[PDB]
Each structure stands twice: as C-alpha cells, then as structure tokens.
Amino acid sequence: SHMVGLIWAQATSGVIGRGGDIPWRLPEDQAHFREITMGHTIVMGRRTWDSLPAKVRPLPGRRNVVLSRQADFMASGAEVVGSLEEALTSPETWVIGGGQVYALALPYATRCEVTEVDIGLPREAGDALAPVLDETWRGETGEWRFSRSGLRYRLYSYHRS
Ligand SMILES: Nc1ncnc2c1ncn2[C@@H]1O[C@H](COP(=O)(O)OP(=O)(O)O)[C@@H](O)[C@H]1OP(=O)(O)O
Ligand SMILES: CCc1nc(N)nc(N)c1-c1ccc(Cl)cc1
C-alpha cells in the first residue's frame, strides 16, 4: 500500500455526470486520464464497472479493481474487492468513480488530478458531483487551453501529506 489518488473531470460547478453521461465531449481529457493512470491500479465502484461497454472494460494497461459487496460478482479481466482498503494495496492507485467510491476513498487520498471543463452547468438534483477539497490541499491550477473542438479546459494537480 502506498499512493492513493483521485482523478475526475468536472464542469466549473462541480457536475461530473448528468443523466448517466459525461456532459461534454473532450478527447484531450481521455488522453489526460490515460496518461495519469497508465501502468497503475485503477479502482472503480461496481455501478461504474457495469456502466462501461462490455468490450471496453477492463481498461487496458492498468490493474482494474472493482469494489462490490457481492462475492460472486463477475468482472471479467479485473479483480473484485469487498472493502476499499483492500483496493489500495497497490503501490499507486487512482480512484476513477463513482460518487460512493470517491467518498470512501477521499480520506486515504493524497493526490487529486482534476480536469475543469469551462462549461456553465449549474447543479441539478440527480447530478453526480465532484469530491469537495479544503484549504489543507495545495498545488497547481494550470492555464486554460482550447481543445481541438474549441471547448476550454484546465488541469488541477493537488496534494496533501
Ligand atoms: N462500503 C462498501 N463496501 C463494498 N462495496 C461498496 C461499498 N460502498 C459502495 N460499494 C460498491 O460500489 C457500488 C457503487 O458504485 P459507484 O461508486 O460506481 O456508484 P455511483 O456512481 O452510483 O456512486 C455499490 O453499489 C457497491 O457495489 P454492490 O452494489 O455491487 O455491492
Ligand atoms: C476519460 C473520462 C475520465 N476523465 C477524468 N479526468 N477522470 C476520470 N475518472 C474519467 C473516467 C471516469 C469513469 C471511467 Cl469508467 C473512466 C474514466
């Protein structure tokens, strides 16, 4: 067990998901997600696993871990753990969602890698929302850049002891 990180992409408001979908199209965030997580362990909740397309899961080049209370759960190509702490035995672990897993994982986390999408989506009932940090987290909020489509985004890299 070692470094636990959270990785997510949010609208400025904190929305990460609405209606079961990512609320924007941003291939550069796909590339950023891949570059942060490749070669490491990724942890997701069972509902997140179930949402992925059958031919996309497990995400290649990473040790995929699915958290579930169901010992019989089938997650072909991944491992299933029944507690989060077991999900963090790896030397470097990125939690990728969803909200229940972020909330369990936040107390272990010492790094967050965030993509802020410049899009105005005030929160609505039902939205999936980003984890909330505080003034004990510190680090770099990067400059805005345009994606190829013109959607603007910037990157946060935060840490704590
Ligand atoms: N404390 C816990 N221990 C074990 N599994 C847990 C857990 N909290 C959440 N989970 C699992 O993680 C699932 C939630 O996945 P998620 O975090 O991707 O969902 P959501 O996106 O809806 O927040 C839960 O339904 C549960 O899986 P099962 O329903 O298969 O048991
Ligand atoms: C590429 C989307 C993405 N972007 C960032 N920045 N973080 C993430 N956690 C995800 C993501 C969420 C759920 C799954 Cl299943 C896979 C990836």
* Residue 127 annotated as part of some ligand binding site: no
Domain boundaries, the chain: 1-161
User: By what technique were these coordinates determined?
Assistant: X-ray
Q: Ligand 1, residue 73: give the atom nearest the CA.
A: 30
Phi, psi of 82 (to 5 degrees): -105, 0
Token code pair at residue 9: 């992409």
Contact 90, 40 (CB under 8 A): yes
* Residue 7 annotated as part of some ligand binding site: yes
Going by C-alpha positions, the residue among 86, 98, 93, 97 that lies closest to residue 109 is: 93
How far, in Å, from the CA of 146 to the mean position of ligand 1? 35
How far, in Å, from the CA of 45 to the mean position of ligand 1? 5
- What does the alpha-carbon distance between residue 5 and residue 3 come to, in Å, rounded to a whole number? 6
Give the list of residues 6+ apart from residue 101 with CB closer than 8 angstroms, or none: 43, 44, 45, 48, 67, 84, 95
Extended beta strands in the chain, E state: 3-11, 15-17, 41-45, 63-67, 79-81, 92-97, 111-117, 128-129, 138-141, 145-146, 152-159
Q: What residue type is 129 in one-letter code?
A: L
Which of the listed residues 15, 49, 65, 68 should we mutate to test ligand 1's pocket, taking the one with most ligand atoms within 8 A of CB?
Answer: 68
Measured in angstroms, the resolution is 1.3
Phi, psi of 120 (to 5 degrees): -95, 100
Contact 44, 96 (CB under 8 A): yes
How far, in Å, from the CA of 37 to the mean position of ligand 2? 10
Per DSSP, the three-state class of 103 is helix
Which residue's structure tokens are 């891949």? 34
CATH homologous superfamily, domain 1-161: Dihydrofolate Reductase, subunit A (3.40.430.10)
* Residue 72 annotated as part of some ligand binding site: no
Token code pair at residue 20: 């079961």
* Residue 9 in contact with ligand 2 by CB distance below 6 A: yes
Phi, psi of 136 (to 5 degrees): -85, -15
Extended beta strands in 12-137, E state: 15-17, 41-45, 63-67, 79-81, 92-97, 111-117, 128-129
